[PDB]
């Protein structure tokens, strides 16, 4: 979620960052939001280790990192289903 406090219409892009995480297919996901409004979108990511993860998300415009924020994710082991009869 990205909030816009400017009085003009904004378009930013953001990239993800993590130690085992990987963006599925998004080099730079650009949005297009109007003044004084938030913008929410879901990005598909794939975890590859289990445990206490650290996602870094950073907003990037014209090669410049605008803003960044770190969240904490717990990835669980993937269990197989019962052997079918």
């Amino acid at each position: 979620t990205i909030r816009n406090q400017l009085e003009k219409e904004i378009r930013v892009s953001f990239a993800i960052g993590g130690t085992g995480f990987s963006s599925v297919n998004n080099d730079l996901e650009t949005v297009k939001m109007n003044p004084n409004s938030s913008y929410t979108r879901i990005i598909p990511v794939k975890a590859k280790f289990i445990g206490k993860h650290k996602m870094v998300v950073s907003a990037i415009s014209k090669g410049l990192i605008i803003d960044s924020k770190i969240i904490d994710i717990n990835v669980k082991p993937k269990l197989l289903p019962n052997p079918r009869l």
Partner: protein, 93 residues
Amino acid sequence: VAEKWFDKNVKVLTIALDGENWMSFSVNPPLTAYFLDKMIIYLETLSDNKFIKLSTLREIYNKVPANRILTNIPTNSWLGTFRKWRGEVPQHE
């Protein structure tokens, strides 16, 4: 209905539901007919004092254009699942 007027962000208020099951699946269906009349009386008491604007959805479509843009809405019903029509009866599959 009126407490929603207090919030500044409530621009359009929308209510949708089945128009026949609510008066036909209650314990005392005749009283639900009196309830509806009382509803209609009270709703006109708010539309005259210029609190709400009791109107049709077509008029809202033209008078209030949509400025925001939604890029994706996931597949779902008002029940949050499709298991009602596929899964809650053993001979659905």
